[PDB]
Amino acid sequence: HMPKSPQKPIVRVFLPNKQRTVVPARCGVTVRDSLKKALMMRGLIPECCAVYRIQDGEKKPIGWDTDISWLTGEELHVEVLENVPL
């Protein structure tokens, strides 16, 4: 056994209903494929969830299929497009 080793570059994603998670920013991997676990455990599909970052005080939208490496050290916030789960 060894202690935790988070010595990797990461991204801070805030999930709906006061939840949050941190994922390692890897080159080649998309934000979608990174947060797929977080979405799954929340029961949310990527197409019903919107992501944005804050730059110079402005909220700019982000595509799920963008490489998470582009967001190394960014704090993301998720929005629910349709709250009622069908």
Side-chain angles (χ1 to χ4, degrees):
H1 177 76
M2 299 183 303
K4 61 180 74 291
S5 182
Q7 185 51 269
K8 316 298 180 179
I10 54 85
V11 181
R12 293 164 47 118
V13 182
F14 297 89
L15 299 178
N17 297 332
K18 305 185 304 182
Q19 305 301 328
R20 71 295 180 207
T21 181
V22 180
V23 291
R26 304 174 181 142
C27 180
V29 181
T30 65
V31 180
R32 194 195 299 258
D33 191 75
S34 298
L35 296 178
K36 61 185 178 187
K37 178 180 181 177
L39 299 177
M40 182 58 180
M41 64 176 299
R42 299 310 312 278
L44 301 177
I45 58 178
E47 306 305 275
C48 185
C49 304
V51 178
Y52 60 89
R53 60 174 299 260
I54 301 181
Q55 185 76 330
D56 292 274
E58 297 179 69
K59 300 173 181 174
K60 289 298 183 300
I62 301 177
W64 289 92
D65 305 292
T66 298
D67 300 76
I68 185 179
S69 58
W70 293 53
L71 303 179
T72 302
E74 296 299 307
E75 293 183 85
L76 306 182
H77 300 268
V78 182
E79 299 295 333
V80 184
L81 302 182
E82 296 193 279
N83 304 88
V84 183
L86 279 297

